[PDB]
């Protein structure tokens, strides 16, 4: 109990069944996703049909981070989030070329989203709604750190209890825990 997850006292309404919070500015999130590939390994183990979604957070990267949350909404709106995840992480943390909102847009353009399509999405209702969802879900759990993962809007993963002597075992322990939780 509490070893691999905790139960929220107030469940999150409208949350993706498997919800990962992250920041492109967060080095740990980069380790979590681009080295451990947690979400990929979780997805492989999830029951068929279960939605896993990543939500961006606003509390890193200054006001640019908030723009990135909106760009991430654009990505989800356009269905390119999986693709742009890598160049956004790399642009922020590796090449350090994401220093303004136009640099974010450039990543999308280079990923094949025309500037005009990005801008129209940026200003669209679907994007505003996705931004509202990301911000509301973070508020609903009083999120103070990333990465974090929540299942069924009810269960918060606790990686602290998990054995880290072997990264492969850690990843599968974590993925197994998510699957178990998703089936509750
Ligand atoms: C920064 C993360 C915790 C952030 C946080 O406080 N989130 C909210 C609370 S909770 O978590 O959701 O409960 C921690 C949790 C698990 C950690 C990871 C795991 O320990 C597995 C490896 C261990 C390696 O030594 C470093 C990379 C890493 C991939 C760790 C990076 C970072 O320290 C993580 C990602």
Residue numbers in the entry: 5 to 188
From the manuscript:
DsbA enzymes catalyze oxidative folding of proteins that are secreted into the periplasm of Gram‐negative bacteria, and they are indispensable for the virulence of human pathogens such as Vibrio cholerae and Escherichia coli. DsbA enzymes retain a conserved tertiary structure, comprising a classical thioredoxin (TRX) domain with an inserted α‐helical domain. The TRX domain contains a pair of redox‐active cysteine residues in a CXXC motif located adjacent to a conserved cis‐proline residue. These features contribute to a hydrophobic patch of residues located in a surface groove of DsbA that is required for substrate recognition.
To identify the structural details of the interaction between TC and DsbA, we solved the crystal structures of TC in complex with oxidized EcDsbA and VcDsbA using molecular replacement at resolutions of 1.79 Å and 1.74 Å, respectively. In the complex with EcDsbA, TC occupies the full length of the hydrophobic groove and buries 435 Å2 of solvent accessible surface area (SASA). It interacts with H32 in the active site and cis‐P151, both of which are highly conserved in DsbA enzymes and critical for disulfide catalysis. The interaction with the steroid core at the right‐hand side of the groove (proximal to the active site) is driven by hydrophobic interactions with F36, L40, M171, F174, P163 and L161. On the left‐hand side (distal to the active site), the negatively charged sulfonate group of TC forms a network of polar interactions with the side chain amide of Q160 and a series of water molecules, and its amide NH forms a hydrogen bond with the backbone amide of cis‐P151. Additional polar contacts are made to a symmetry related EcDsbA molecule through the amide carbonyl and hydroxyl groups of TC which point away from the hydrophobic groove, however no hydrophobic interactions are made to the symmetry related EcDsbA molecule and the solution HSQC NMR data are consistent with the binding mode determined by X‐ray crystallography with significant CSP located in the hydrophobic groove. The side chains of F174, T168 and M171in EcDsbA are oriented towards the active site, which narrows the right‐hand side of the hydrophobic groove forming a small hydrophobic pocket around TC, pushing TC further towards the left‐hand end of the groove where additional interactions are formed. The VcDsbA‐TC interface consists of three direct polar interactions to the backbone amide of Gly161 and the side chains of His32 and Tyr170, whereas the EcDsbA‐TC interface has two direct polar interactions to the backbone of Pro151 and the side chain of Gln160. Comparison of the crystal structure of TC bound to EcDsbA with previously reported co‐structures of EcDsbA in complex with diaryl ether 3 shows the steroid core of TC makes similar hydrophobic interactions to diaryl ether 3 in the hydrophobic groove.
